[PDB]
Amino acid sequence: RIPTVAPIKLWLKKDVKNVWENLVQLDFFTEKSAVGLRDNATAAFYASNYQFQGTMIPFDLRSYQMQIILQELRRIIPKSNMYYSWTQL
Amino acid sequence: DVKKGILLQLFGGTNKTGDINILLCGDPSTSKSQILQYVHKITPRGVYTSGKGSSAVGLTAYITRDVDTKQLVLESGALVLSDGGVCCIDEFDKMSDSTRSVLHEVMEQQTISIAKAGIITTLNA
DNA sequence: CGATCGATCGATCGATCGATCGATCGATCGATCGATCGATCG
DNA sequence: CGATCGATCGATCGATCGATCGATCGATCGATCGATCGATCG
Ligand SMILES: Nc1ncnc2c1ncn2[C@@H]1O[C@H](COP(=O)(O)OP(=O)(O)O)[C@@H](O)[C@H]1O
Protein backbone atom coordinates (compact mmCIF):
# COMPACT_ATOMS: atom_id res chain seq x y z
CA ARG A 1 0.00 0.00 0.00
CA ILE A 2 3.08 2.24 0.06
CA PRO A 3 3.72 3.08 -3.63
CA THR A 4 7.08 2.14 -5.12
CA VAL A 5 9.44 4.94 -6.12
CA ALA A 6 10.97 5.06 -9.59
CA PRO A 7 14.82 4.86 -9.74
CA ILE A 8 9.06 -1.78 6.91
CA LYS A 9 11.24 -4.67 8.06
CA LEU A 10 9.98 -8.23 8.11
CA TRP A 11 11.92 -9.41 11.15
CA LEU A 12 13.71 -12.72 10.75
CA LYS A 13 12.00 -15.87 11.99
CA LYS A 14 14.86 -16.37 14.46
CA ASP A 15 14.51 -12.91 16.03
CA VAL A 16 10.74 -13.37 16.49
CA LYS A 17 11.49 -16.24 18.90
CA ASN A 18 12.30 -13.80 21.71
CA VAL A 19 9.05 -11.94 21.09
CA TRP A 20 7.16 -15.24 21.22
CA GLU A 21 8.88 -16.18 24.48
CA ASN A 22 8.01 -12.79 25.98
CA LEU A 23 4.33 -13.13 25.08
CA VAL A 24 4.03 -16.72 26.32
CA GLN A 25 5.31 -15.70 29.77
CA LEU A 26 3.04 -12.63 30.08
CA ASP A 27 0.01 -14.97 29.78
CA PHE A 28 -1.36 -13.37 26.62
CA PHE A 29 -1.09 -16.88 25.14
CA THR A 30 -1.67 -20.25 26.77
CA GLU A 31 -0.99 -23.84 25.77
CA LYS A 32 -3.92 -25.70 24.18
CA SER A 33 -5.03 -27.55 27.33
CA ALA A 34 -2.87 -25.93 30.02
CA VAL A 35 -4.34 -26.82 33.42
CA GLY A 36 -1.93 -24.32 34.97
CA LEU A 37 -1.54 -24.22 38.74
CA ARG A 38 -2.69 -27.54 40.18
CA ASP A 39 -4.97 -27.57 43.21
CA ASN A 40 -3.23 -29.95 45.63
CA ALA A 41 0.14 -31.59 46.22
CA THR A 42 -0.94 -35.02 44.92
CA ALA A 43 -2.12 -33.44 41.66
CA ALA A 44 1.23 -31.64 41.40
CA PHE A 45 3.01 -34.96 41.94
CA TYR A 46 1.08 -36.68 39.14
CA ALA A 47 1.60 -33.62 36.93
CA SER A 48 5.38 -33.51 37.46
CA ASN A 49 5.66 -37.27 36.90
CA TYR A 50 3.96 -37.02 33.50
CA GLN A 51 5.65 -35.49 30.44
CA PHE A 52 3.30 -33.39 28.31
CA GLN A 53 3.65 -33.52 24.53
CA GLY A 54 3.43 -29.72 24.32
CA THR A 55 6.78 -29.43 26.10
CA MET A 56 8.49 -31.88 23.70
CA ILE A 57 7.28 -30.78 20.25
CA PRO A 58 9.34 -28.03 18.56
CA PHE A 59 9.10 -24.36 19.47
CA ASP A 60 7.53 -23.63 16.07
CA LEU A 61 4.66 -26.14 16.39
CA ARG A 62 3.36 -25.78 19.96
CA SER A 63 -0.40 -25.20 19.93
CA TYR A 64 -1.68 -22.12 21.77
CA GLN A 65 -4.98 -20.42 22.55
CA MET A 66 -5.62 -16.72 23.04
CA GLN A 67 -6.64 -14.81 26.17
CA ILE A 68 -7.38 -11.38 24.65
CA ILE A 69 -9.84 -11.74 21.77
CA LEU A 70 -9.40 -9.40 18.80
CA GLN A 71 -12.51 -7.42 19.79
CA GLU A 72 -10.96 -6.62 23.17
CA LEU A 73 -7.80 -5.56 21.33
CA ARG A 74 -9.79 -3.16 19.17
CA ARG A 75 -11.39 -1.78 22.33
CA ILE A 76 -8.03 -1.27 24.03
CA ILE A 77 -5.49 -0.59 21.26
CA PRO A 78 -5.23 3.14 20.51
CA LYS A 79 -6.34 4.13 17.03
CA SER A 80 -3.12 6.13 16.60
CA ASN A 81 -1.25 2.81 16.40
CA MET A 82 -0.04 1.89 12.92
CA TYR A 83 -1.26 -1.70 13.27
CA TYR A 84 -4.69 -0.64 14.58
CA SER A 85 -6.25 -0.89 11.11
CA TRP A 86 -5.62 -4.65 11.27
CA THR A 87 -7.58 -5.04 14.52
CA GLN A 88 -10.46 -5.76 12.15
CA LEU A 89 -10.43 -8.89 10.02
CA ASP B 1 -46.55 -0.74 12.08
CA VAL B 2 -47.65 -2.92 9.15
CA LYS B 3 -50.44 -0.42 8.45
CA LYS B 4 -48.10 2.59 8.44
CA GLY B 5 -45.38 1.24 6.16
CA ILE B 6 -47.77 -0.17 3.57
CA LEU B 7 -49.58 3.17 3.70
CA LEU B 8 -46.19 4.84 3.32
CA GLN B 9 -45.70 2.54 0.32
CA LEU B 10 -48.78 4.06 -1.31
CA PHE B 11 -47.62 7.61 -0.57
CA GLY B 12 -44.16 6.88 -1.98
CA GLY B 13 -41.04 9.01 -1.96
CA THR B 14 -40.34 11.99 -4.22
CA ASN B 15 -38.71 11.51 -7.61
CA LYS B 16 -36.45 14.41 -8.57
CA THR B 17 -34.58 15.53 -11.67
CA GLY B 18 -38.70 7.19 -5.09
CA ASP B 19 -40.46 3.84 -4.99
CA ILE B 20 -40.55 2.00 -1.65
CA ASN B 21 -40.53 -1.81 -1.53
CA ILE B 22 -41.66 -3.95 1.40
CA LEU B 23 -41.32 -7.63 2.31
CA LEU B 24 -43.65 -9.43 4.72
CA CYS B 25 -42.07 -12.35 6.62
CA GLY B 26 -44.27 -14.22 9.06
CA ASP B 27 -46.00 -17.44 9.98
CA PRO B 28 -48.43 -18.64 7.27
CA SER B 29 -51.60 -17.62 9.07
CA THR B 30 -51.37 -13.83 9.68
CA SER B 31 -53.04 -11.35 7.36
CA LYS B 32 -50.27 -11.42 4.74
CA SER B 33 -52.42 -12.24 1.72
CA GLN B 34 -55.35 -9.99 2.63
CA ILE B 35 -53.33 -6.76 2.66
CA LEU B 36 -51.76 -7.46 -0.74
CA GLN B 37 -55.22 -8.19 -2.15
CA TYR B 38 -56.36 -4.81 -0.82
CA VAL B 39 -53.36 -2.95 -2.23
CA HIS B 40 -53.83 -3.98 -5.86
CA LYS B 41 -57.59 -3.35 -5.54
CA ILE B 42 -56.96 0.15 -4.14
CA THR B 43 -54.13 1.27 -6.46
CA PRO B 44 -54.51 2.13 -10.16
CA ARG B 45 -53.52 -0.68 -12.54
CA GLY B 46 -51.83 -2.91 -9.99
CA VAL B 47 -50.77 -6.41 -11.02
CA TYR B 48 -51.21 -9.53 -8.89
CA THR B 49 -48.35 -12.01 -9.29
CA SER B 50 -47.15 -15.23 -7.69
CA GLY B 51 -44.04 -17.37 -7.74
CA LYS B 52 -44.95 -20.21 -10.10
CA GLY B 53 -47.65 -18.14 -11.81
CA SER B 54 -45.03 -15.99 -13.54
CA SER B 55 -41.85 -16.47 -15.55
CA ALA B 56 -38.74 -14.52 -16.47
CA VAL B 57 -40.69 -13.11 -19.44
CA GLY B 58 -43.71 -12.68 -17.19
CA LEU B 59 -42.42 -9.59 -15.43
CA THR B 60 -40.20 -8.74 -18.41
CA ALA B 61 -41.97 -7.59 -21.56
CA TYR B 62 -41.34 -9.92 -24.50
CA ILE B 63 -39.46 -7.69 -26.94
CA THR B 64 -39.44 -8.97 -30.52
CA ARG B 65 -38.94 -7.56 -34.01
CA ASP B 66 -41.76 -7.14 -36.51
CA VAL B 67 -41.90 -9.61 -39.40
CA ASP B 68 -42.96 -7.07 -42.04
CA THR B 69 -41.98 -3.61 -40.77
CA LYS B 70 -38.86 -4.93 -38.96
CA GLN B 71 -39.33 -2.43 -36.13
CA LEU B 72 -38.93 -3.26 -32.45
CA VAL B 73 -42.20 -4.03 -30.65
CA LEU B 74 -43.07 -5.03 -27.09
CA GLU B 75 -45.89 -7.28 -25.88
CA SER B 76 -46.16 -5.85 -22.33
CA GLY B 77 -45.28 -7.41 -18.99
CA ALA B 78 -46.16 -7.41 -15.32
CA LEU B 79 -43.41 -4.95 -14.37
CA VAL B 80 -44.19 -2.84 -17.46
CA LEU B 81 -47.97 -2.71 -16.97
CA SER B 82 -47.56 -1.47 -13.39
CA ASP B 83 -45.13 1.36 -14.20
CA GLY B 84 -45.75 3.97 -11.52
CA GLY B 85 -48.02 1.57 -9.62
CA VAL B 86 -47.60 -1.29 -7.16
CA CYS B 87 -46.90 -4.91 -8.07
CA CYS B 88 -48.02 -7.57 -5.59
CA ILE B 89 -45.86 -10.70 -5.47
CA ASP B 90 -46.98 -13.67 -3.38
CA GLU B 91 -44.63 -16.53 -2.51
CA PHE B 92 -41.68 -14.23 -3.24
CA ASP B 93 -39.35 -16.85 -1.75
CA LYS B 94 -40.52 -19.54 -4.20
CA MET B 95 -39.62 -17.35 -7.17
CA SER B 96 -37.29 -19.14 -9.57
CA ASP B 97 -33.64 -18.15 -9.37
CA SER B 98 -33.63 -16.93 -12.98
CA THR B 99 -36.79 -14.92 -12.31
CA ARG B 100 -35.36 -13.67 -9.01
CA SER B 101 -32.11 -12.64 -10.71
CA VAL B 102 -33.66 -10.00 -12.98
CA LEU B 103 -35.09 -8.17 -9.96
CA HIS B 104 -31.76 -6.54 -9.08
CA GLU B 105 -31.70 -4.18 -12.07
CA VAL B 106 -35.46 -3.57 -11.83
CA MET B 107 -35.42 -2.78 -8.11
CA GLU B 108 -32.37 -0.48 -8.16
CA GLN B 109 -32.18 1.00 -11.68
CA GLN B 110 -35.82 0.54 -12.83
CA THR B 111 -34.59 -0.78 -16.19
CA ILE B 112 -34.66 -4.12 -18.01
CA SER B 113 -31.84 -4.49 -20.53
CA ILE B 114 -32.07 -7.40 -22.96
CA ALA B 115 -29.33 -8.63 -25.29
CA LYS B 116 -30.46 -11.42 -27.61
CA ALA B 117 -30.07 -12.32 -31.27
CA GLY B 118 -30.67 -9.14 -33.24
CA ILE B 119 -32.19 -7.18 -30.33
CA ILE B 120 -30.22 -4.84 -28.06
CA THR B 121 -32.35 -2.44 -26.00
CA THR B 122 -33.37 -1.47 -22.47
CA LEU B 123 -36.81 -0.78 -21.00
CA ASN B 124 -38.19 1.21 -18.08
CA ALA B 125 -40.18 -0.52 -15.35
C1' DC C 1 13.05 -51.81 60.43
C1' DG C 2 10.68 -48.29 56.70
C1' DA C 3 10.84 -43.79 53.44
C1' DT C 4 11.64 -42.14 48.39
C1' DC C 5 11.32 -42.74 43.26
C1' DG C 6 11.09 -44.27 38.65
C1' DA C 7 8.58 -47.35 35.78
C1' DT C 8 3.86 -49.83 34.04
C1' DC C 9 -1.09 -50.56 33.32
C1' DG C 10 -5.97 -49.40 33.22
C1' DA C 11 -9.12 -46.03 32.45
C1' DT C 12 -11.00 -41.73 30.49
C1' DC C 13 -11.41 -36.93 27.81
C1' DG C 14 -11.21 -35.41 23.39
C1' DA C 15 -9.76 -34.41 18.73
C1' DT C 16 -10.32 -36.71 14.72
C1' DC C 17 -11.81 -39.43 10.85
C1' DG C 18 -14.50 -42.80 7.53
C1' DA C 19 -19.20 -44.39 5.63
C1' DT C 20 -23.56 -42.87 4.35
C1' DC C 21 -27.31 -39.77 3.21
C1' DG C 22 -30.12 -36.12 1.35
C1' DA C 23 -29.86 -31.34 -0.23
C1' DT C 24 -27.85 -27.18 -3.61
C1' DC C 25 -25.76 -25.44 -7.78
C1' DG C 26 -24.91 -26.42 -12.49
C1' DA C 27 -23.88 -28.63 -17.13
C1' DT C 28 -26.32 -29.80 -20.95
C1' DC C 29 -29.64 -32.75 -24.20
C1' DG C 30 -34.19 -32.07 -25.81
C1' DA C 31 -38.27 -29.38 -27.09
C1' DT C 32 -39.95 -25.30 -29.30
C1' DC C 33 -39.75 -21.04 -32.03
C1' DG C 34 -38.55 -18.19 -36.08
C1' DA C 35 -37.07 -16.41 -40.61
C1' DT C 36 -36.65 -16.62 -45.51
C1' DC C 37 -37.73 -19.19 -49.20
C1' DG C 38 -39.68 -23.07 -52.23
C1' DA C 39 -43.52 -26.42 -54.41
C1' DT C 40 -48.64 -27.10 -55.18
C1' DC C 41 -52.78 -25.12 -55.80
C1' DG C 42 -56.43 -21.74 -57.04
C1' DC D 1 -51.61 -12.40 -58.93
C1' DG D 2 -52.41 -14.70 -54.05
C1' DA D 3 -53.10 -18.61 -50.34
C1' DT D 4 -51.36 -22.99 -48.15
C1' DC D 5 -47.55 -26.96 -46.23
C1' DG D 6 -42.31 -28.18 -46.00
C1' DA D 7 -37.52 -28.53 -45.12
C1' DT D 8 -33.52 -26.44 -42.87
C1' DC D 9 -30.49 -24.28 -39.33
C1' DG D 10 -29.71 -20.71 -35.83
C1' DA D 11 -31.44 -19.08 -31.34
C1' DT D 12 -33.81 -19.55 -26.82
C1' DC D 13 -35.71 -21.92 -22.93
C1' DG D 14 -36.01 -25.58 -19.66
C1' DA D 15 -35.95 -29.83 -17.28
C1' DT D 16 -33.19 -33.82 -16.03
C1' DC D 17 -29.35 -35.96 -14.61
C1' DG D 18 -25.28 -35.18 -12.27
C1' DA D 19 -21.29 -32.81 -9.68
C1' DT D 20 -20.70 -30.78 -5.17
C1' DC D 21 -21.34 -30.26 0.00
C1' DG D 22 -22.96 -30.06 4.94
C1' DA D 23 -24.63 -33.13 8.17
C1' DT D 24 -24.81 -37.56 11.46
C1' DC D 25 -23.54 -42.68 13.10
C1' DG D 26 -19.81 -45.55 14.19
C1' DA D 27 -14.92 -45.82 15.68
C1' DT D 28 -10.31 -44.78 17.80
C1' DC D 29 -6.27 -43.56 18.92
C1' DG D 30 -3.58 -39.16 20.79
C1' DA D 31 -3.07 -37.12 25.22
C1' DT D 32 -3.57 -37.38 30.09
C1' DC D 33 -4.72 -38.82 35.06
C1' DG D 34 -4.48 -41.82 38.51
C1' DA D 35 -3.52 -46.38 40.67
C1' DT D 36 -0.03 -50.22 41.06
C1' DC D 37 4.48 -51.79 42.21
C1' DG D 38 8.93 -53.03 41.93
C1' DA D 39 13.19 -50.89 43.03
C1' DT D 40 16.58 -47.95 46.08
C1' DC D 41 18.80 -46.29 50.58
C1' DG D 42 18.41 -43.88 55.56
N1 LIG E 1 -54.41 -9.87 12.80
C2 LIG E 1 -55.42 -10.36 12.05
N3 LIG E 1 -56.48 -9.59 11.72
C4 LIG E 1 -57.49 -10.07 10.98
N5 LIG E 1 -57.55 -11.33 10.50
C6 LIG E 1 -56.55 -12.21 10.76
C7 LIG E 1 -55.41 -11.76 11.57
N8 LIG E 1 -54.57 -12.80 11.67
C9 LIG E 1 -55.12 -13.84 10.99
N10 LIG E 1 -56.30 -13.49 10.44
C11 LIG E 1 -57.16 -14.40 9.64
O12 LIG E 1 -56.40 -15.55 9.28
C13 LIG E 1 -56.55 -15.87 7.90
C14 LIG E 1 -55.19 -16.03 7.24
O15 LIG E 1 -55.36 -15.93 5.83
P16 LIG E 1 -54.32 -15.09 4.93
O17 LIG E 1 -53.60 -14.11 5.83
O18 LIG E 1 -55.10 -14.55 3.75
O19 LIG E 1 -53.27 -16.16 4.35
P20 LIG E 1 -52.27 -17.02 5.29
O21 LIG E 1 -53.16 -18.06 5.92
O22 LIG E 1 -51.26 -17.57 4.31
O23 LIG E 1 -51.69 -16.01 6.25
C24 LIG E 1 -57.31 -14.73 7.25
O25 LIG E 1 -58.54 -15.22 6.70
C26 LIG E 1 -57.59 -13.73 8.35
O27 LIG E 1 -58.99 -13.43 8.40
CB of B31 shorter than 6 A to ligand 1: yes
Expressed in Å, this structure's resolution amounts to 3.3
| C1’ D21 / CA A89, Å | 26
- Technique used to solve these coordinates: cryo-EM
CB of B100 shorter than 6 A to ligand 1: no
> DSSP 3-state assignment of A87?
helix
Number of CB atoms found within 10 A of residue B54's CB: 19
Ligand 1, atom 5, residue with closest C-alpha = B31
DSSP letters spanning B79-120: HHHTTTS-EEESSGGGS-HHHHHTHHHHHHH-EEEEEETTEE
A11 touches strand D (CB under 7 A): no
- What is d(CA B60, CA B102) in angstroms, rounded to the nearest whole number? 9
Ligand 1, atom 26, residue with closest C-alpha = B31
> DSSP 3-state assignment of B121?
strand
| CA A3 to ligand 1 centroid distance, Å | 63
- What is d(CA B86, CA B96) in angstroms, rounded to the nearest whole number? 21
